[PDB]
Each structure stands twice: as structure tokens, then as C-alpha cells.
């Protein structure tokens, strides 16, 4: 049974957490599909596909003129991918435009739903209409999460719009919480951080962190949060948090 989770964060970490989170699932077991919705096309670049060079891409599929199947590329880490370019900034133009925007990638991954175990997307540094169709596609969303300084400055804005999102394209959208990047435990600072979000706002700040950057420290804790996310899904299991019940 497909599950969907949105990576998200308004504020420019997120990319590798998609593709980490998605290699650790595609060793455990699981069919992985990951979806770039950033037309500057991190995630697409850092797995191996030169966006320019894309014949088709997500662009083509939220606006219907080609198939799901058709755009997907493989990656040499054994996941799917589907693809962004910068042809995609157009279609946060052309979308608000037709009614029913938000739904767009939904319908989309609908078309794939028995292909894939769990579906990662990968949403742009804001909060219009891309970002938006990531949400309105999820079943769960994940804030990464910096912890180097303290400018979470922009949590609130973004609690107020999954907020926004339940309440009118998605009542099941649910917020496990955010994910720790760029912990660095050589000070507490990272930590004096974490604590202090985890204070001021309504927000699940979960674990492990991952450490600033095969078997290195930030591969194992992708990993021991990736089997995190598998136990919620199969058998409800509490994400474990930062600071443990």
C-alpha cells in the first residue's frame, strides 16, 4: 500500500535527506520512487540526469500532456526518479491558472499507485503552488531541519500552511516532525538549538540528527531513520524523537 512523503522547507540538506531517506528504503527492501519538484533541479542533478538535457519531464506530467511512466528515469542506486527541469517554473505559471491546481501530482502518482512501496518528493524552497501539489500528494511531510544557527525564523509560516493544507486539499496530510540537519555535537549549540524550536512551536523534532557532512555517521543515521519511517508505516510506531519520551 503506497506511501507518500513529502520532504519540505521553504528555506534553502532537504535534497540529500530525499535521496538518502530513498537509497536506505530501496536497501531495506522497498520500491522507491523519488519526485523532483524543484525546477533548479537539485535532486535530479545530484542523481546523475542533467536536467537540460531531459526530453520530458514532471513539467510535462502535472500538465498532462504526457504520461507518468514515460518521464521516469533510473538511478544508479536502484530508485525511480521523476524528474525536473527549468520548464517546471513554468508550470507554477500555467496552474494557478486551471482549477484544481493543487491535485495535479496526485492524479499523477495515482496512475502509478501498485508500482511503488513508498513515493519521496522532494519540494521546492517555497511555499506557491509546487510546493503545494507535494503536499496535497502526501500522506506525511517531514521539515529538514538546520540546526548549525538559530534562524528558525519561518517555522510558523510553514506550520501555518500544512495547517492551511489539511484543512482544505488534504485532511490526511500528517506532520511527523522535523528532521535534524547539519548537527554538529562537538558544541551543544545544535542542540541549545533543537530545544529552543521544540519550545516555541507545536513541531515534533525527531531522531536521529543527521551529523554535518557507505558506512559513514550521516549514512547510518539516514539509515536508522529511514527503518523509523518503515515501522510507523507498518505498524503505527511513534517516530522516535530528539529528545525520547
Given at each position: 500500500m503506497t506511501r507518500v512523503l513529502a520532504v519540505a522547507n521553504q528555506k534553502g540538506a532537504k535534497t540529500t535527506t530525499v535521496?538518502?531517506?530513498?537509497?536506505a528504503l530501496t536497501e531495506q527492501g522497498r520500491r522507491v520512487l523519488l519526485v523532483d519538484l524543484d525546477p533548479q533541479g537539485c535532486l535530479t542533478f545530484s542523481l546523475g540526469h542533467d536536467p537540460d538535457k531531459l526530453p520530458v519531464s514532471v513539467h510535462e506530467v502535472l500538465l498532462g500532456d504526457v504520461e507518468?511512466?514515460?518521464?521516469?528515469?533510473?538511478?544508479?542506486?536502484?530508485?525511480?526518479?521523476?524528474?525536473?527541469?527549468?520548464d517546471l517554473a513554468g508550470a507554477e505559471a500555467m496552474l494557478l491558472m486551471r482549477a484544481g491546481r493543487e491535485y495535479a501530482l496526485k492524479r499523477a502518482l495515482a496512475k502509478l499507485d501498485g508500482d511503488f512501496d513508498v513515493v519521496i518528493?522532494?519540494?521546492?524552497?517555497?511555499?506557491?503552488?509546487?510546493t503545494l501539489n507535494?503536499?496535497?500528494?502526501?500522506?506525511?511531510?517531514?521539515?529538514?531541519?538546520?540546526?548549525?544557527?538559530?534562524?528558525?525564523?519561518?517555522?510558523?509560516?510553514?506550520?501555518?500552511?500544512?495547517?492551511?493544507?489539511?484543512?482544505?486539499?488534504?485532511?490526511?496530510?500528517?506532520?511527523?516532525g522535523a528532521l535534524p540537519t547539519l548537527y554538529d555535537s562537538r558544541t551543544t549549540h545544535s542542540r541549545d538549538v533543537l530545544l529552543d524550536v521544540a519550545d516555541r512551536?507545536?513541531?515534533?523534532?525527531?531522531?536521529?540528527?543527521?551529523?554535518r557532512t557507505r558506512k559513514s555517521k550521516g549514512?547510518?543515521?539516514?539509515?536508522?531513520?529511514?527503518?523509523?519511517?518503515?515501522?510507523?508505516?507498518?505498524?503505527?510506531?511513534?517516530?522516535?524523537?530528539?529528545?525520547?519520551?
Open positions: 535521496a538518502s531517506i530513498g537509497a507518468p511512466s514515460a518521464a521516469l528515469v533510473r538511478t544508479d542506486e536502484g530508485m525511480t526518479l521523476l524528474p525536473a527541469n527549468i518528493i522532494d519540494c521546492p524552497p517555497s511555499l506557491g503552488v509546487l507535494g503536499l496535497t500528494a502526501a500522506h506525511d511531510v517531514i521539515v529538514p531541519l538546520q540546526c548549525e544557527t538559530l534562524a528558525h525564523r519561518g517555522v510558523g509560516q510553514f506550520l501555518r500552511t500544512i495547517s492551511d493544507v489539511q484543512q482544505i486539499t488534504n485532511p490526511d496530510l500528517k506532520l511527523l512551536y507545536e513541531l515534533p523534532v525527531l531522531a536521529p540528527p543527521i551529523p549514512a547510518i543515521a539516514y539509515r536508522e531513520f529511514a527503518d523509523a519511517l518503515l515501522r510507523h508505516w507498518k505498524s503505527g510506531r511513534k517516530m522516535p524523537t530528539f529528545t525520547p519520551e
